[PDB]
Amino acid sequence: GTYQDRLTKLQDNLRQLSVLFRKLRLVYDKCNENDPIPVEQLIPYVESEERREIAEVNKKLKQKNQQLKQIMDQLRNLIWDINAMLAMRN
Amino acid sequence: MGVTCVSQMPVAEGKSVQQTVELLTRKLEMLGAEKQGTFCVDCETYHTKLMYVMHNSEYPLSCFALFENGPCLIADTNFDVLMVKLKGFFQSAKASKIETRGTRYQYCDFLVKVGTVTMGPSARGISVEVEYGPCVVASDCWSLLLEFLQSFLGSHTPGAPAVFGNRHDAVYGPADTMVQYMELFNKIRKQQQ
Amino acid sequence: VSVNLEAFSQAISAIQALRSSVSRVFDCLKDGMRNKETLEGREKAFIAHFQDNLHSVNRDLNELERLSNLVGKLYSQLLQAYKWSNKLQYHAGLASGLLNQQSLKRSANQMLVLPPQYVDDVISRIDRMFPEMSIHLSRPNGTSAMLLVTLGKVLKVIVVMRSLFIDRTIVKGYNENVYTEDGKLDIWSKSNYQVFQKVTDHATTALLHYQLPQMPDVVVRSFMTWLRSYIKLFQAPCQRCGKFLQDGLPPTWRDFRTLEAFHDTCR
Amino acid sequence: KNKLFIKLTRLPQYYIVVEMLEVPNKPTQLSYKYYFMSVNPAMALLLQQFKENMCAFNKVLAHFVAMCDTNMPFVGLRLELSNLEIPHQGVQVEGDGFSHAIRLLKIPPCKGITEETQKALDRSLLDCTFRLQGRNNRTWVAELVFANCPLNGTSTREQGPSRHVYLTYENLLSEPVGGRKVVEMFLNDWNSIARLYECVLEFARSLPDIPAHLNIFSEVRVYNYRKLILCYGTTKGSSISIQWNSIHQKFHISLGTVGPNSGCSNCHNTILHQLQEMFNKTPNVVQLLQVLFDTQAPLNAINKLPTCFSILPQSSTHIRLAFRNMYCIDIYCRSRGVVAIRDGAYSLFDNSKLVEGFYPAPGLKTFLNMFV
Amino acid sequence: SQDQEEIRTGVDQCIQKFLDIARQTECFFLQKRLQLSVQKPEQVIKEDVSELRNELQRKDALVQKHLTKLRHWQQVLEDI
Amino acid sequence: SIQLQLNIGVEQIRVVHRDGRVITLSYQEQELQDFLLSQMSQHQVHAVQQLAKVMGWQVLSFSNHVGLGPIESIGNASAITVASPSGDYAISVRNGPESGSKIMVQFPRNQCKDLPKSDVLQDNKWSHLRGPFKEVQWNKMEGRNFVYKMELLMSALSPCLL
Amino acid sequence: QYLCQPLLDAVLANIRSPVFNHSLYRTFVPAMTAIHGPPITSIPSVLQGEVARLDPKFLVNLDPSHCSNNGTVHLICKLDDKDLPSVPPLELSVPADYPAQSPLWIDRQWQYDANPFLQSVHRCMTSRLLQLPDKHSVTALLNTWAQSVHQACLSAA
Ligand SMILES: [Zn+2]
């Protein structure tokens, strides 16, 4: 009776495979709907207010990283306290 | 404990007993082996049945008591206290000081006990003994000891020890090496000279 | 038996090759001549090919008897329904494929609890063979299992697991107290041997080598299979330098996917 | 007295000496004299005092040690190029400074094939430079380039005047990366490329003259200077491998099903041991192709017979079916879809004498003639 | 469908051409969004904001989750 | 490939890496501070070696440590060079602890149309090989990571697919 | 090898015979075709490979003087280095069959005069070139000419 579970599993797998096939066809048409400009413009030759939002939130997320950094440093002190507890518990 | 090879090599037409010993030590210094101290194995016989009541400086607590060929008692100090009390069942049988005296050397957990053989005060032989520490099981590492023997002895390279004929797959015992030492003593006591 | 049934194949091919080769001997000598410009490029090639085909017949005759020496020695309707089950075994090998373990994985980034009795069932699967080694499972500290392994008369190994995954593994010899004075298994110590401490580093590199993100059972099975090669220690010389001792060290390092004893210098 | 002996792990018998030296004016600085020397049964062989062009590093020495292990591995390569007399340039730098290479100028061309082959291969190469990469720095690479290929593949190898092929070689742990056996196998495979490129022209002249039924029957797909495939069948339903095997001195043609249009297997393998035997005789591809074009129809149902029936083949288009152990069938394929049907169980030659085990089978042609 | 050598070839050259036909789509996709990378700078910074906002939530998604969790070992610890 | 396990003794240090190495250091914190960056240099070196093993830009030369050019003050520089399977492009760079990312890409002749033609240079078959060089800088160029910068550029100089 | 001497003795007896191809035919042809089955239905390329991997820091070209299209060839060298100062351009001499022969180089002592630096350059040339091995390529002489300029510049500076 073990054979039935594997075949039902593979039937669900191929159903999801067909769904994924059709959705990649959909997004392939969606990405291919817009291209006029060709390649070889892409090689890098040597010869507005959203940027304010980016600049202001970069240091806010860095400050959040530091604020959690002091907290996890305090937790590091706590875990260095707690690992010596079991070290000489007996 | 570890697998041991024990043999004799003579003066071998070069100067004296200790000249070849010094040649081996300077060869080992060319290899560059450090020392761990000295060693000496002393023997003494008793009889009514030949009692080999015998000692080694490597394990001074180990007082070996053997028959001529029977079981061996690696016994403690109080056995030596009990041994004195008989004196009529087992006579002293003095003048049996056949000893091997020398030094021990180490090279990357390899140990060498090399020295000369004496009948008390007078030296009439050279004892050669090679061994390795982690040799737990016997008769499985003889290629290593054979390579070590041919590495620096050159001439007089021995092989096939007597206790290797006592084939077993258990841990090598100090009684095996000890046996080898008394067989060595039997080899040297015949020639005297 | 199939050793004779496959050793007969060389002889049954060799006799037909004898027939074909003697047919070649007949017709090539019967072909007359093909000069191809110069005569010295033909008449000296005449004896060359006449030796060639006759000696081919001779060597075919000769290799016939060394194969002949080694060899030794409802009625048909229901026979047809027997071997189809046996060819269904080949049909099982039809859909196998040689792709096997190797895949084309990219980065795994987008855009749990299991009982210790499952760990016991895991350890019972592979301990059933290799009788020279033993497994002693114990959990004196928490639900994590650390195991004592004896290897014949050679090695005593403590193997600590945690969270069903690998924690640690320390190997010592055969004549040491692996327990403590209290009797518990030792946790933090050293093997007190140069070779053992040297190969513990190789063990640590090996445990970080077998990397399965989901399937640690094959990781520890490959680990103990790798360890099984270490019962041949102090008994096999090195494969490139000939001698055992490289600066006094016998070969120990078994290479990944190719298990043979080497050194760090011996790679 | 202030010296150290440094040995390259990959390259022993060679040593680095750092003659550390002192300065008298400054009691707190030093100097070095770096030397090169080789050790043989050992003897010092040469000296090379190396030139003048928080302080605990001495990057000068590590700078030297890199150029130890990255240059003297090239010693044995240039050594044996002249020792077997190959035209070759010496120690160079490949383009940008962080590079070294050896360019081979000319190769001893060939033997045993007509010598016009030697020119075009000498025309096909322009450069034979070598490079070293890989872990432990023991992976030699040789990208031997070929302009003006005779023929491309149906894949996208149909491009401009270049066929550069990476040729990698690596020696044993002993007998190091400069090993004469490594170039010994190098000439082997090139000869193996040579003998096939020899046959490339030997059928490239046989290319323009084909009856061209095999054009639509069989399509060439894979050419790689070492192997060749065909994909034959009207449905392109089977394939045959073309590859030289030097220790065999043979070709191991692989009869194989390709494409999602078949039954159970390739089934050309009944005559497998027989088709190999015929191409021992002939180096002609059409001999292979045309036998397929004839035997396609009768062998289509020969293997589909039950078993009663079996395939014990005699010669090519001498196919011999046999019913059980007392009745036999003869099938003889021919071009333009012709099959010659013998009795099988009769004797051709004796009417006084017949076959012992095959009792003769009469009345066969009447059953044929009713099909007629 | 309806002696092994066809199988090894058949499973090979399909796959090796299939990894051929796939890696070039990557390089084609490498072409298409490098086109979008250099022809306009705004879709670069749209997706740069898009990845950090989705980082901004998941940063905030855990910290007051952490805080609620922080509230969890409160009563876990006064049990004695 | 980068795995760092640190056994912390009282005065002895054991370092475990992937390639089977043990390292013992002193009390000095700088002896590990410089060593971690020296192995970060190797990390950046090998970030290109295993990158090319997937997409098939074949590797030509690779060395663990090179000393061609200047001498690095911190450690020892390494050099690796590969080439594209798609014809004209090869990547040559030497990375050092203080002098890293020296990218000089290799280009063929009769493409820049500026390399002079000698009188002996009369046949066009040898002219399609990667003779000249051109330095490409690591600054003001696309990519938000070390491998991200180079992966955009190697996929840029490619034949037309569209 | 064993019991084949009738076949060997027949061909040596039937050799130097004009009926050989017909005597063998007459004695052999019906035996195999009956039972076994019926019949079937300017400049050499050596220098071209040499200059391919020569350094771009040399711009060596042919001499405008002397004879052409002959066995002996001469190549005058051009050095365009910002690191190194100006020197006389130098000219070689290579005869026919350039592999497996040892070529030469022209001599002009007065061109390297009016400066002891040029005399030291000439002395370094006579030092390095006299120990060059036999039958070497032009890369060795070109590179030994190149390095001696730095070797004299370090002494001059
Ligand atoms: Zn070794």
DSSP 8-state secondary structure symbol assigned to residue B153: T
Q: Is D133 on the interface with F (CB under 8 A)?
A: yes
For testing contact with chain E, the best of F55, F155, F162 (most E CBs within 10 A): F155
**C-alpha C200 to ligand 1 mean position (Å):** 18
CB contact under 8 A, C30 and G24: yes
Secondary structure element (H or E) that encloses residue G33, with its range: helix G20-35
List residues of chain A with CB under 8 Å from any CB of chain F.
38-40, 42-44, 46
Judging contact as 3 or more Cβ pairs under 8 Å, the answer for E and F is yes
Judging contact as 3 or more Cβ pairs under 8 Å, the answer for G and A is no
CB contact under 8 A, C243 and B147: yes
How many CB atoms sit inside 10 A of residue G30's CB?
9
Query: G21 contacts in C (CB within 8 Å)?
Result: 32-33
Query: A54 contacts in F (CB within 8 Å)?
Result: none
How many angstroms is the resolution?
Answer: 8.2
Q: Are F128 and F109 in contact (CB under 8 A)?
A: yes
For testing contact with chain G, the best of D89, D127, D347, D355 (most G CBs within 10 A): D89
Q: First CA to last CA across chain D, in angstroms?
A: 108
Q: Is F106 on the interface with D (CB under 8 A)?
A: yes
Chain centroid to CA C157: how far? 25
Q: Which residues contact D205 (CB under 8 A, 6 or more apart)?
A: none
Cα→Cα distances C175→B172, C155, C171, C183, D102, Å: 11, 9, 12, 16, 58
Residue with tokens 């002009």: G108
What are D186's two structure tokens? 């190098």
The rounded distance, in Å, linking the Cα atoms of D257 and D264 is 10
Method: cryo-EM
DSSP 8-state secondary structure symbol assigned to residue F106: E
The rounded distance, in Å, linking the Cα atoms of C159 and C166 is 8
Helix axes C216-228, C116-126, angle to 10 degrees: 40
DSSP 8-state secondary structure symbol assigned to residue B56: E
Closest-CA residue in chain F for G73? F120
Query: A50 contacts in E (CB within 8 Å)?
Result: 45, 49
SS3 sequence of E16-69: HHHHHHHHHHHHHHHHHHHHHHHHCCHHHHHHHHHHHHHHHHHHHHHHHHHHHH
**C-alpha D175 to ligand 1 mean position (Å):** 15
Closest CA to F80 of F68, F71, F72, F70: F68
Q: Is D270 on the interface with E (CB under 8 A)?
A: no
Alpha carbon of C11: minimum distance to chain G alpha carbons (Å): 20
CB contact under 8 A, E34 and F152: yes
Q: Could you give the count of Cα atoms lying within 13 Å of D44 in the half-sphere of its Cβ?
A: 10
Please give the single-letter amino acid code of residue G97. D
**C-alpha C193 to ligand 1 mean position (Å):** 19
Instruction: Tell me how long chain E is.
Output: 80
CB contact under 8 A, E31 and F162: yes
Secondary structure element (H or E) that encloses residue A52, with its range: helix A50-87
**C-alpha C260 to ligand 1 mean position (Å):** 11
SS3 sequence of chain D: CCCCEEECCCCCCEEEEEEEEECCCCCCCEEEEEEEEECCCCCCCCCCCCCCCCCCCCHHHHHHHHHHHCCHHHHHHHHHHHHCCCCECCCCCCCCCCCCCEEECCCCCCCCCCCHHHHHHHHHCCCEEEEEECHHHCEEEEEEECCCCCCCCCCCCCCCCCCEEEEEECCCCCCCCCCHHHHHHHHHHHHHHHHHHHHHHHHHCCCCCCCCHHHHHEEEEEECCCEEEEEECCCCCEEEEEEEECCCCEECCCEECCCCCCCCCCCCHHHHHHHHHHHHHCCCHHHHHHHHHHHCCHHHHHCCCCCCEEECCCCCCCEEEEECCCEEEEEEEECCCEEECCCCCCCCCCCCCCCCCCCCCCCHHHHHHHHC
CB contact under 8 A, D98 and F65: no
Q: Is D269 on the interface with E (CB under 8 A)?
A: yes
CB contact under 8 A, E34 and F155: yes
Cα→Cα distances B143→B147, C174, C249, D291, G14, Å: 6, 21, 14, 64, 68
Q: Are F17 and F36 in contact (CB under 8 A)?
A: no
3-state secondary structure of F45: helix
CB contact under 8 A, C98 and E15: no
**C-alpha C171 to ligand 1 mean position (Å):** 22
Query: E7 contacts in C (CB within 8 Å)?
Result: 94, 97
CB contact under 8 A, E37 and F162: no
Cα→Cα distances B75→B64, C69, D194, Å: 6, 66, 82
Q: Is E45 on the interface with C (CB under 8 A)?
A: no
The rounded distance, in Å, linking the Cα atoms of D257 and D271 is 15
DSSP 8-state secondary structure symbol assigned to residue B138: S
3-state secondary structure of B117: strand
CB contact under 8 A, D262 and E10: no
Query: E37 contacts in F (CB within 8 Å)?
Result: 142, 152
Q: Are G153 and G121 in contact (CB under 8 A)?
A: no
- In this complex, which of E39, E52, E63 lies closest to A37 when CB atoms are compared? E39
DSSP 8-state secondary structure symbol assigned to residue G40: P
**C-alpha F70 to ligand 1 mean position (Å):** 37
Q: Is C95 on the interface with E (CB under 8 A)?
A: no
List residues of chain G with CB under 8 Å from any CB of chain F.
42-43, 47-48, 51-52, 56, 59-62, 75
Number of D:F CB contacts under 8 A? 107
Looking only at the bridges linking them, the beta strands covering D238-245 and D250-251 are: antiparallel
Q: Are D197 and D114 in contact (CB under 8 A)?
A: no
Which residues of chain D from 186 to 245 reach within 8 Å of chain F, CB to CB?
A: none
3-state secondary structure of B59: coil
Query: F18 contacts in C (CB within 8 Å)?
Result: 205, 208-209
Residue with tokens 């069942």: B89
Q: Which chains touch G (3 or more CB pairs under 8 A)?
A: C, D, F
**C-alpha C251 to ligand 1 mean position (Å):** 5
The rounded distance, in Å, linking the Cα atoms of C208 and C142 is 25
CB contact under 8 A, E11 and C98: yes
Which residues of chain E from 13 to 42 reach within 8 Å of chain D, CB to CB?
A: 13, 17
Q: Are B171 and C152 in contact (CB under 8 A)?
A: no
Query: G34 contacts in D (CB within 8 Å)?
Result: 349
- In this complex, which of F55, F156, F161 lies closest to E34 when CB atoms are compared? F156
List residues of chain E with CB under 8 Å from any CB of chain F.
23-24, 26-28, 30-31, 34, 37-38
Q: Is C92 on the interface with E (CB under 8 A)?
A: no
Query: C267 contacts in D (CB within 8 Å)?
Result: 136, 173
Q: Are D194 and D110 in contact (CB under 8 A)?
A: yes
